[model samples]
Target: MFEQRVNSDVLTVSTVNSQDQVTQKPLRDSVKQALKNYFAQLNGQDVNDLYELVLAEVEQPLLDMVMQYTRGNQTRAALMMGINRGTLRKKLKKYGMN
Candidate 1:
């Protein structure tokens, strides 16, 4: 039999629209650099792999925060994001979130 293992720590949560202090080169700047590095390291990789990476690394965490702010209401979350509810569901699935 083939064994399958899933690691919770390997799962990533997205963190979009996070607030940071207004200091010079603030926390947000560090996040931007991290994103740049993530993609830069995958230069010339498959498009689908890059897409999955972005969704897992960025979108998933972002949606989670938005959902929390909206009190778990998908409609309100989508409205806040200026996107359709269906689109949000698709994104959620892509991020293995909902």
Candidate 2:
């Protein structure tokens, strides 16, 4: 179910934004390094649920940041999220946002 625990990309980390003209893509690049660490400290037990696990991992902070930006207004945050109030409410409860 897996190829190799270690990545070839691990040999070098690049600073993309350091170039004189181009700007950094913060989110994607951050996740690259984030998941790099995920494997760094990750033990080779067994990993099956790859996609869903990372979504849940990323979703918590995403919801938290949105709510904090809206200052705890569900309606506003949901609209900004382009998501449903009911759905957002479920996530809030799921994460114990209150």
Best by lDDT: 2
* Candidate 2 per-residue C-alpha lDDT over 1-98 given as tens digits, one digit per residue, 9 for 90 to 100: 76663444433334545456554343555678888988988978778997988888888988999989999999999999899999999998988999
Native-referenced Cα lDDT, model 1: 0.71
The CA-based lDDT of model 2 is what? 0.80
Instruction: List candidate 2 segments past 4 Å from native.
Output: 1-25
Q: Provide the lowest-lDDT 10-residue window in model 2.
A: 5-14
Q: Score residue 1 of candidate 2 by CA lDDT.
A: 75
Clashing pairs in 1: 14-61, 14-62
Q: What local distance difference test score does each model get?
A: 0.71, 0.80
Among these predictions, the greatest TM-score belongs to: 2
Against the true structure, candidate 1 reaches a TM-score of 0.53
